[PDB]
Amino acid sequence: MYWVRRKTIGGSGLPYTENEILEWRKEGVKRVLVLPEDWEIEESWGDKDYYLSILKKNGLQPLHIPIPDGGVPSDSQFLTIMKWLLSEKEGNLVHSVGGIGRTGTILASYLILTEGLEVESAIDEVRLVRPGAVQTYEQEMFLLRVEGMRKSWLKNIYS
Ligand SMILES: O=[N+]([O-])c1ccc(OP(=O)(O)O)cc1
C-alpha cells in the first residue's frame, strides 16, 4: 500500500486477505473508496457485499463506486468521489484492483484540484510512490478534462 500525501490520501490494489485490510487500518487508513467492479471484487472474495461488509467491519467507511478496468469515473461519480474525499482529509485510501491505473487516475485528479498541478506533473508525483501510475489514453483524456474545469470542479464541490 502507498501514501501519496502522508495520511491524507493514498492507494493500493485490491487486498486478498483480511490482514491486508488491517494493514491499512494500521498504516492509518480510516475511510475507503472502493473502485473495482462487482465481478472484480467477487472473483477475489466470492462476494462483493461481503467484502464491503468487512470493510465496514474494521470501521472503515466504504464507498463503492464502480469504474471498469482502464476506464474513468463519470462526471457524476467523480463529483460524488470528491464530495467524499474532500470531506474527511485524513485517512483516505483509494483502491481498485491493481492499484495503478484507475487509482492512479483518481489520486492525480485529486492533486490536480487540490494542489492545482498540471497532469504530467500530478502524474509525476503519483508515479513517485506508485510507479507506472495511469495506463490508458482514456484516463489521460479525463485528467485533462478535469484540469480544464478545476474552476467549476471546485465550485461544484464546495457549493
Ligand atoms: O491484474 N489484474 O487483473 C488487474 C490489474 C490492474 C487493474 O487496474 P487498476 O487497479 O486500475 O490498475 C485491473 C486488473
mmCIF file of all heavy atoms in Angstrom, residues 12-14 36 39-40 68-71 95-104 135 139, ligand 1:
data_model
loop_
_atom_site.group_PDB
_atom_site.id
_atom_site.type_symbol
_atom_site.label_atom_id
_atom_site.label_comp_id
_atom_site.label_asym_id
_atom_site.label_seq_id
_atom_site.Cartn_x
_atom_site.Cartn_y
_atom_site.Cartn_z
ATOM 1 N N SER A 12 -3.811 1.684 -3.228
ATOM 2 C CA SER A 12 -3.289 0.339 -3.407
ATOM 3 C C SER A 12 -4.226 -0.476 -4.310
ATOM 4 O O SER A 12 -5.236 0.034 -4.825
ATOM 5 C CB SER A 12 -3.145 -0.351 -2.054
ATOM 6 O OG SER A 12 -4.423 -0.631 -1.497
ATOM 7 N N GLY A 13 -3.874 -1.739 -4.518
ATOM 8 C CA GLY A 13 -4.713 -2.584 -5.328
ATOM 9 C C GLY A 13 -5.830 -3.142 -4.463
ATOM 10 O O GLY A 13 -6.216 -2.552 -3.447
ATOM 11 N N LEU A 14 -6.350 -4.287 -4.879
ATOM 12 C CA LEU A 14 -7.410 -4.956 -4.163
ATOM 13 C C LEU A 14 -6.757 -5.979 -3.238
ATOM 14 O O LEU A 14 -5.986 -6.828 -3.694
ATOM 15 C CB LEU A 14 -8.342 -5.641 -5.166
ATOM 16 C CG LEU A 14 -9.131 -6.896 -4.760
ATOM 17 C CD1 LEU A 14 -10.059 -6.601 -3.616
ATOM 18 C CD2 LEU A 14 -9.918 -7.384 -5.959
ATOM 19 N N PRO A 36 -12.946 -1.166 -7.727
ATOM 20 C CA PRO A 36 -13.163 -2.310 -8.629
ATOM 21 C C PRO A 36 -14.622 -2.528 -9.066
ATOM 22 O O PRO A 36 -15.550 -1.927 -8.528
ATOM 23 C CB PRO A 36 -12.644 -3.494 -7.815
ATOM 24 C CG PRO A 36 -11.607 -2.885 -6.938
ATOM 25 C CD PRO A 36 -12.254 -1.600 -6.499
ATOM 26 N N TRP A 39 -17.828 -7.811 -10.171
ATOM 27 C CA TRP A 39 -17.168 -9.069 -10.528
ATOM 28 C C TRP A 39 -15.674 -9.104 -10.190
ATOM 29 O O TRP A 39 -15.135 -10.160 -9.832
ATOM 30 C CB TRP A 39 -17.381 -9.387 -12.018
ATOM 31 C CG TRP A 39 -16.695 -8.444 -12.940
ATOM 32 C CD1 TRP A 39 -17.156 -7.226 -13.368
ATOM 33 C CD2 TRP A 39 -15.356 -8.575 -13.456
ATOM 34 N NE1 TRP A 39 -16.175 -6.581 -14.112
ATOM 35 C CE2 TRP A 39 -15.065 -7.381 -14.179
ATOM 36 C CE3 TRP A 39 -14.372 -9.577 -13.371
ATOM 37 C CZ2 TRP A 39 -13.836 -7.164 -14.807
ATOM 38 C CZ3 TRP A 39 -13.140 -9.358 -14.003
ATOM 39 C CH2 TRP A 39 -12.887 -8.159 -14.710
ATOM 40 N N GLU A 40 -15.007 -7.956 -10.304
ATOM 41 C CA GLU A 40 -13.594 -7.882 -9.981
ATOM 42 C C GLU A 40 -13.405 -8.212 -8.501
ATOM 43 O O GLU A 40 -12.518 -8.986 -8.121
ATOM 44 C CB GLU A 40 -13.041 -6.485 -10.305
ATOM 45 C CG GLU A 40 -12.701 -6.281 -11.789
ATOM 46 C CD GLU A 40 -12.193 -4.878 -12.097
ATOM 47 O OE1 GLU A 40 -12.891 -3.899 -11.750
ATOM 48 O OE2 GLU A 40 -11.098 -4.748 -12.693
ATOM 49 N N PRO A 68 -14.890 0.566 -14.496
ATOM 50 C CA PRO A 68 -14.371 -0.538 -15.309
ATOM 51 C C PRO A 68 -12.871 -0.397 -15.524
ATOM 52 O O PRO A 68 -12.346 0.725 -15.615
ATOM 53 C CB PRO A 68 -15.159 -0.404 -16.605
ATOM 54 C CG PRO A 68 -16.469 0.178 -16.135
ATOM 55 C CD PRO A 68 -15.997 1.250 -15.187
ATOM 56 N N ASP A 69 -12.181 -1.532 -15.603
ATOM 57 C CA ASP A 69 -10.728 -1.521 -15.795
ATOM 58 C C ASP A 69 -10.321 -0.591 -16.934
ATOM 59 O O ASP A 69 -10.921 -0.614 -18.013
ATOM 60 C CB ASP A 69 -10.219 -2.946 -16.096
ATOM 61 C CG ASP A 69 -8.714 -3.090 -15.874
ATOM 62 O OD1 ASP A 69 -8.016 -2.060 -15.787
ATOM 63 O OD2 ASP A 69 -8.225 -4.235 -15.794
ATOM 64 N N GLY A 70 -9.303 0.228 -16.680
ATOM 65 C CA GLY A 70 -8.801 1.144 -17.689
ATOM 66 C C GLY A 70 -9.731 2.293 -18.029
ATOM 67 O O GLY A 70 -9.440 3.091 -18.928
ATOM 68 N N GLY A 71 -10.845 2.382 -17.306
ATOM 69 C CA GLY A 71 -11.803 3.440 -17.557
ATOM 70 C C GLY A 71 -11.638 4.622 -16.625
ATOM 71 O O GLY A 71 -10.641 4.741 -15.920
ATOM 72 N N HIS A 95 -8.655 2.537 -3.766
ATOM 73 C CA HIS A 95 -8.128 1.311 -4.319
ATOM 74 C C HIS A 95 -9.036 0.747 -5.400
ATOM 75 O O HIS A 95 -10.269 0.896 -5.364
ATOM 76 C CB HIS A 95 -7.917 0.274 -3.214
ATOM 77 C CG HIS A 95 -9.141 -0.520 -2.893
ATOM 78 N ND1 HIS A 95 -9.491 -1.657 -3.590
ATOM 79 C CD2 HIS A 95 -10.131 -0.307 -1.996
ATOM 80 C CE1 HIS A 95 -10.646 -2.108 -3.138
ATOM 81 N NE2 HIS A 95 -11.056 -1.308 -2.172
ATOM 82 N N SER A 96 -8.389 0.130 -6.382
ATOM 83 C CA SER A 96 -9.060 -0.538 -7.478
ATOM 84 C C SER A 96 -8.465 -1.940 -7.395
ATOM 85 O O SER A 96 -8.201 -2.425 -6.299
ATOM 86 C CB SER A 96 -8.743 0.143 -8.822
ATOM 87 O OG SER A 96 -7.400 0.584 -8.889
ATOM 88 N N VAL A 97 -8.227 -2.586 -8.528
ATOM 89 C CA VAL A 97 -7.681 -3.939 -8.500
ATOM 90 C C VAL A 97 -6.161 -3.939 -8.428
ATOM 91 O O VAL A 97 -5.577 -4.385 -7.452
ATOM 92 C CB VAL A 97 -8.163 -4.737 -9.737
ATOM 93 C CG1 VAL A 97 -7.495 -6.117 -9.783
ATOM 94 C CG2 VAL A 97 -9.700 -4.847 -9.703
ATOM 95 N N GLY A 98 -5.519 -3.437 -9.471
ATOM 96 C CA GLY A 98 -4.069 -3.392 -9.481
ATOM 97 C C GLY A 98 -3.555 -2.228 -8.661
ATOM 98 O O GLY A 98 -2.446 -2.288 -8.139
ATOM 99 N N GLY A 99 -4.364 -1.172 -8.553
ATOM 100 C CA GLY A 99 -3.963 -0.003 -7.794
ATOM 101 C C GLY A 99 -2.893 0.781 -8.520
ATOM 102 O O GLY A 99 -1.967 1.315 -7.909
ATOM 103 N N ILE A 100 -3.026 0.847 -9.837
ATOM 104 C CA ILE A 100 -2.066 1.557 -10.665
ATOM 105 C C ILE A 100 -2.774 2.511 -11.617
ATOM 106 O O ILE A 100 -2.545 3.727 -11.563
ATOM 107 C CB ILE A 100 -1.204 0.577 -11.471
ATOM 108 C CG1 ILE A 100 -0.533 -0.420 -10.517
ATOM 109 C CG2 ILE A 100 -0.163 1.353 -12.274
ATOM 110 C CD1 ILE A 100 0.472 -1.339 -11.185
ATOM 111 N N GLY A 101 -3.636 1.951 -12.469
ATOM 112 C CA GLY A 101 -4.401 2.745 -13.417
ATOM 113 C C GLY A 101 -5.523 3.602 -12.820
ATOM 114 O O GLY A 101 -5.365 4.804 -12.602
ATOM 115 N N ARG A 102 -6.665 2.971 -12.554
ATOM 116 C CA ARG A 102 -7.843 3.649 -12.010
ATOM 117 C C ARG A 102 -7.618 4.418 -10.718
ATOM 118 O O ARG A 102 -8.221 5.476 -10.497
ATOM 119 C CB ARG A 102 -8.971 2.640 -11.804
ATOM 120 C CG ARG A 102 -9.686 2.270 -13.079
ATOM 121 C CD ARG A 102 -10.552 1.032 -12.890
ATOM 122 N NE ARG A 102 -9.734 -0.151 -12.657
ATOM 123 C CZ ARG A 102 -10.218 -1.365 -12.416
ATOM 124 N NH1 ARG A 102 -11.529 -1.565 -12.379
ATOM 125 N NH2 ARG A 102 -9.391 -2.386 -12.203
ATOM 126 N N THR A 103 -6.762 3.876 -9.855
ATOM 127 C CA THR A 103 -6.459 4.517 -8.591
ATOM 128 C C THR A 103 -5.529 5.690 -8.879
ATOM 129 O O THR A 103 -5.760 6.801 -8.390
ATOM 130 C CB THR A 103 -5.796 3.520 -7.622
ATOM 131 O OG1 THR A 103 -6.706 2.441 -7.360
ATOM 132 C CG2 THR A 103 -5.445 4.200 -6.309
ATOM 133 N N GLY A 104 -4.495 5.442 -9.689
ATOM 134 C CA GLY A 104 -3.560 6.494 -10.038
ATOM 135 C C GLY A 104 -4.295 7.701 -10.625
ATOM 136 O O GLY A 104 -4.000 8.861 -10.321
ATOM 137 N N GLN A 135 -2.509 4.228 -16.920
ATOM 138 C CA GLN A 135 -2.149 3.359 -18.032
ATOM 139 C C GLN A 135 -2.970 3.413 -19.322
ATOM 140 O O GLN A 135 -2.687 2.653 -20.243
ATOM 141 C CB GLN A 135 -2.108 1.908 -17.512
ATOM 142 C CG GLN A 135 -3.178 1.590 -16.464
ATOM 143 C CD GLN A 135 -2.970 0.248 -15.748
ATOM 144 O OE1 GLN A 135 -1.865 -0.070 -15.285
ATOM 145 N NE2 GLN A 135 -4.046 -0.532 -15.636
ATOM 146 N N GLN A 139 -7.908 7.511 -19.512
ATOM 147 C CA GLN A 139 -7.610 8.194 -18.256
ATOM 148 C C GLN A 139 -6.881 9.529 -18.457
ATOM 149 O O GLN A 139 -7.185 10.525 -17.787
ATOM 150 C CB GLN A 139 -6.832 7.239 -17.340
ATOM 151 C CG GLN A 139 -7.614 5.924 -17.108
ATOM 152 C CD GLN A 139 -6.762 4.768 -16.578
ATOM 153 O OE1 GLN A 139 -5.581 4.625 -16.937
ATOM 154 N NE2 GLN A 139 -7.368 3.923 -15.737
HETATM 155 O O1 LIG B 1 -4.071 -7.885 -12.727
HETATM 156 N N1 LIG B 1 -5.241 -7.556 -12.925
HETATM 157 O O2 LIG B 1 -6.156 -8.370 -13.113
HETATM 158 C C1 LIG B 1 -5.568 -6.084 -12.937
HETATM 159 C C2 LIG B 1 -4.522 -5.136 -12.710
HETATM 160 C C3 LIG B 1 -4.824 -3.740 -12.718
HETATM 161 C C4 LIG B 1 -6.189 -3.285 -12.953
HETATM 162 O O3 LIG B 1 -6.496 -1.944 -12.966
HETATM 163 P P1 LIG B 1 -6.037 -0.753 -11.870
HETATM 164 O O4 LIG B 1 -6.495 -1.229 -10.492
HETATM 165 O O5 LIG B 1 -6.786 0.460 -12.332
HETATM 166 O O6 LIG B 1 -4.539 -0.680 -12.057
HETATM 167 C C5 LIG B 1 -7.219 -4.265 -13.178
HETATM 168 C C6 LIG B 1 -6.911 -5.658 -13.172
#
